[PDB]
Amino acid sequence: NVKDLKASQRVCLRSDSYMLHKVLENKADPLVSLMMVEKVPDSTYDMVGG
Amino acid sequence: TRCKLKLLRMERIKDHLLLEEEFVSNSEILKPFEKKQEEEKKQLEEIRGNPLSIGTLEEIIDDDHAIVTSPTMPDYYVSILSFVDKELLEPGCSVLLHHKTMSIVGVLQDDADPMVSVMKMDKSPTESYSDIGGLESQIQEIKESVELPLTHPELYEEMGIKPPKGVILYGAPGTGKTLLAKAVANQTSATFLRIVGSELIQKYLGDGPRLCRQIFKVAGENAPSIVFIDEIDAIGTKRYDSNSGGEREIQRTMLELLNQLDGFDDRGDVKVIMATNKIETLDPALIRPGRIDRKILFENPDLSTKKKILGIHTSKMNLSEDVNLETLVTTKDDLSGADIQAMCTEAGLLALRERRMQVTAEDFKQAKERVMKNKVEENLEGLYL
Amino acid sequence: EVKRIQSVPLVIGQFLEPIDQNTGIVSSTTGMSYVVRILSTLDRELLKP
Amino acid sequence: HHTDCKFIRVSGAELVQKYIGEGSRMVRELFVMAREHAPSIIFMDEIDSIG
Amino acid sequence: AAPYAAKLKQTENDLKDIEARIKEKAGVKESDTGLAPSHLWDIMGDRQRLGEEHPLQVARCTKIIKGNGESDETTTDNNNSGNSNSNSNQQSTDADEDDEDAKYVINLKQIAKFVVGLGERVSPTDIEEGMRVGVDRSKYNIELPLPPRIDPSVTMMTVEEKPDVTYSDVGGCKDQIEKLREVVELPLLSPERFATLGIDPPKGILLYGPPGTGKTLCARAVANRTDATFIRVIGSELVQKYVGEGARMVRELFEMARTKKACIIFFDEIDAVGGARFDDGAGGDNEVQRTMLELITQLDGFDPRGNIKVMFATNRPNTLDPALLRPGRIDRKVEFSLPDLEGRANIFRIHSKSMSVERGIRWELISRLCPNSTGAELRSVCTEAGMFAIRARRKVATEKDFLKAVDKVISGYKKFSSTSRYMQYN
Ligand SMILES: Nc1ncnc2c1ncn2[C@@H]1O[C@H](COP(=O)(O)OP(=O)(O)OP(=O)(O)O)[C@@H](O)[C@H]1O
Ligand SMILES: Nc1ncnc2c1ncn2[C@@H]1O[C@H](COP(=O)(O)OP(=O)(O)OP(=O)(O)O)[C@@H](O)[C@H]1O
Ligand SMILES: [Mg+2]
Ligand SMILES: [Mg+2]
């Protein structure tokens, strides 16, 4: 419904009418994909002691 | 304890009722009608296909057609037809087109665009009627120009003068020029436009002059208004790039801004605010006096002004019995209002450092010396001595 | 029959990231985001980056 | 790593990513991303060998 | 921590309730677009939408060909051109004859060029260069001509005829104003004297100067005095220029003045549009250069002008072409400059005239204290003095109220150099 779609909601669409599919919370941008490249933070304070 | 309960007494019952009221009413609206309006709606939906390609109306030719420029590369002579009027449209307004054969099938936009969305804000102002002290005088100059025509237009008519248009806040960083404008806007209860001047500019060309138009267009629909175009410096005299990809963009965008500010008429009903670092990051003539009244130079708090800023902060933190109000001022030398707030954040971190629940004497003293050390010069007294 | 589809012509795109374990989102070298069904008989552990 | 915060790390000046949009507006989107996925630490780089 | 702790969670739930309340509200808005007088528009609305009759693409002619002599058959012909009226009527070794002319080559607003035919409504006298023409969705062919460019209706706004400005609304009876009279009025009244002397009568003028002098006020002033109708174009307000759109902006208004008699063509603010080209620059534009090339030739052509005068205001003479700066386009040059004491007295008297203030004030007294200044700054002293006056709750601004207003603008000047002087005791 239009009570189930919100402002600033990303959504999927077809291409032969652009008819909606469903809601998506994965927002795809080059900055968000930069987090995928970087991977997880590492190390610990005693590795970088001194 | 008793009065925060009183805020709860007012807000919980009235607010909670309001959600519930909306929710039943959405059903209730439907039930009064069962023909006529339903019928007309039904045939609007048969007529208007799915999807609808957006248009932008350039102009109306009076004969039941018009010309639109659309995000589809070629332009169209479209017709005005079906549940739309010739006078339900105005030029430059956004229209809805029919996918198959472009026709204006009505409007449900009326200047609805994303740049409009960034610009309008439903947020709460940070300051309300100068919550934080200092700069008492400078606000009684913004207010004369901006707030005062809106509140009482009559007084200017006895005087026989035209009423001011706009203000320019400029000079020092950390003095809360961007926050005084927010204060003034809450005091009146005006429409505030946080657009930023830097949010019209992108690498891609030719988009920008549309955006400049849209600001003045929306501001006039919801007038009275206060428009704040914050950080109009970046779009100043300067250039994007020294190679390519931006030789045009700054040049078109600025010029286009001056034009529709003047072209309204010389109004005292839509004010503008230009927030800028200096006039040395902009062009040497703007648009250029008699028309842009008044200019406000921010400079550093003096001993009176910086006392006032400080008293606000210190009272919201534990103790003040330990080190006198005066003793903080004395130790400090004259600086912007950010440096005064900075000493108090550092003081609080120092109480954490000790693991106290009081801001002790020791904490105040260190926090004062720290800020002074950033931010330092000593050749004022070295030339001298 | 599948194998025919796999052979040329193909258009380059770039895989970004999954949204499911069988549908992903790419953006092409055309300059268009397309949400695409991923084919079985390929990596989905070394496909993720 | 210890705070249990986002990372990113932004390497240098932003213009470089264009795969969708431009890098000028990824600064605007710094807000949107930081907030949704809060708690965040952002290690914003720019050494300033620009001078 | 029970007094604040418990009350903190209670605060929080209310805010979240309010956020949720706004998403319930915005999912339903006000019904619909349905209006009883446009429900009758629906009868015609079904038929046209389903039919092949709209949209028409907007195209515009960009190149004219003559449809014989074009070189369409290429069998026994040579070059890219034929005899310029025949190509298939003098020979049937091509094996074809055709009698189609004025075929025309359009450009779409997608930047794709096509040759098209002519409809049943079109003849070669309904089409021209630069005129919008509507063509099909699919296979193209002109159906109905649309008027030239996007210029009409937008230009007419900028044009005001017969100004409500005289040399009372201009202060100072300046040097430039005395040389201005000679250009418009003197050869209009009597072209006899100019002829006999053997000078060719002044009709070009370029008003230029720093901002805020009021170069425009004068120009308006004399337009009314000479009693000539006034035609204004502003080339930094009107920014249509794309592929010789601004040459069509120029042509219309010049062309209109030419049909009339006793006219003023005022070309204003041509720093951009019909101004300096940016080929040399990093801008790469030569779209303003079409506007330039047209403007020159319109002037030159008009000559002898029959006592219809072409005027120019441009801020800088650095944004002009040196062909304009040859005589027969511009003949007279006036730099507007800071008014004298009494000239600044006069601009103060007009500002003050509109005000409802105490009359015991003397205009000369205020302007003494004032330095050399622009008119726009003296507009600022009166508007500032008005604001001080209501604030103190006087319905009049005394002589003293204007001295405070003067002083604040000056104090700013002192802030940017160094304050304190020897004039605190001298
Ligand atoms: N009159 C005042 N109104 C608001 N805050 C003030 C006032 N005077 C001083 N302050 C202090 O100044 C501080 C700094 O304000 P802020 O950093 O937002 O500055 P700004 O001049 O708008 O800056 P920028 O150049 O960074 O856009 C406030 O947090 C407050 O402590
Ligand atoms: N000669 C004057 N008499 C009275 N007021 C004047 C005079 N000159 C300028 N002003 C004041 O300055 C205001 C703005 O300047 P004006 O429009 O006259 O100037 P300009 O130098 O021709 O401008 P632009 O660079 O904007 O084309 C006028 O509306 C008027 O109030
Ligand atoms: Mg600021
Ligand atoms: Mg002017």
UniProtKB/Swiss-Prot annotation, chain A:
Assembly and interaction partners: May form a homodimer or a heterodimer with a related family member. Interacts with OLA1, TMA17, and UBR1.
Similarity comment: family membership: Belongs to the AAA ATPase family.
Role, per record: The 26S proteasome is involved in the ATP-dependent degradation of ubiquitinated proteins. The regulatory (or ATPase) complex confers ATP dependency and substrate specificity to the 26S complex.
Cellular compartments annotated: Cytoplasm; Nucleus
PTM entry text: N-acetylated by NAT1.
Designated name of the protein: 26S proteasome regulatory subunit 8 homolog
Superkingdom of the source species: Eukaryota
Residue range from the parent sequence: 103 to 152 of 405
Note: Present with 4700 molecules/cell in log phase SD medium.
From Swiss-Prot, chain B:
Position of the Glycyl lysine isopeptide (Lys-Gly) (interchain with G-Cter in ubiquitin) cross-link: K182, K203, K238
Annotated SUPFAM superfamilies: P-loop containing nucleoside triphosphate hydrolases (SSF52540)
Binding site for ATP: G171, A172, P173, G174, T175, G176, K177, T178
Keywords associated with the record: ATP-binding, Cytoplasm, Isopeptide bond, Lipoprotein, Myristate, Nucleotide-binding, Nucleus, Proteasome, Ubl conjugation
Keyword ATP-binding: yes
GO molecular function: ATP binding; ATP hydrolysis activity; proteasome-activating activity
Keyword check for Nucleus: yes
GO terms (BP aspect): nonfunctional rRNA decay; peptide catabolic process; positive regulation of protein catabolic process; proteasome regulatory particle assembly; proteasome-mediated ubiquitin-dependent protein catabolic process; protein-containing complex localization; ubiquitin-dependent protein catabolic process
GO-annotated cellular components: cytoplasm; nucleus; proteasome complex; proteasome regulatory particle, base subcomplex
Annotated compartments: Cytoplasm; Nucleus
InterPro entries per UniProt: 26S_Proteasome_ATPase (IPR050221), AAA+_ATPase (IPR003593), AAA_lid_3 (IPR041569), ATPase_AAA_core (IPR003959), ATPase_AAA_CS (IPR003960), NA-bd_OB-fold (IPR012340), P-loop_NTPase (IPR027417), Prot_ATP_ID_OB_2nd (IPR032501)
Similarity comment: family membership: Belongs to the AAA ATPase family.
Function of the molecule: The 26S proteasome is involved in the ATP-dependent degradation of ubiquitinated proteins. The regulatory (or ATPase) complex confers ATP dependency and substrate specificity to the 26S complex. Has ATPase activity.
Name assigned to this protein: 26S proteasome regulatory subunit 4 homolog
Gene: RPT2
UniProtKB/Swiss-Prot annotation, chain C:
Location(s) in or outside the cell: Cytoplasm; Nucleus
Maturation and modification: N-acetylated by NAT3.
Protein task: The 26S proteasome is involved in the ATP-dependent degradation of ubiquitinated proteins. The regulatory (or ATPase) complex confers ATP dependency and substrate specificity to the 26S complex.
Protein family (similarity comment): Belongs to the AAA ATPase family.
Protein name: 26S proteasome regulatory subunit 6B homolog
Native organism: Saccharomyces cerevisiae (strain ATCC 204508 / S288c)
Lineage of the species this protein comes from: Eukaryota, Fungi, Dikarya, Ascomycota, Saccharomycotina
Residues of the full protein shown: 85 to 133 of 428
Swiss-Prot record, chain E:
One Pfam family in the UniProt entry: AAA
Protein name per its UniProtKB record: 26S proteasome regulatory subunit 7 homolog
Localisation: Cytoplasm; Nucleus
Binding, ATP: G209, P210, P211, G212, T213, G214, K215, T216
One term under GO cellular component: proteasome regulatory particle, base subcomplex
Region (Disordered): 67-99
Positions carrying Phosphoserine: S123, S190
Subunit structure: Interacts with UBR1 and CIC1.
Keyword Oxidoreductase: no
Miscellaneous notes: Present with 105 molecules/cell in log phase SD medium.
Biased composition (Low complexity): 76-93
Family that this chain belongs to: Belongs to the AAA ATPase family.
GO molecular function annotations of the record: ATP binding; ATP hydrolysis activity; proteasome-activating activity; ubiquitin protein ligase binding
PTM description: The N-terminus is blocked.
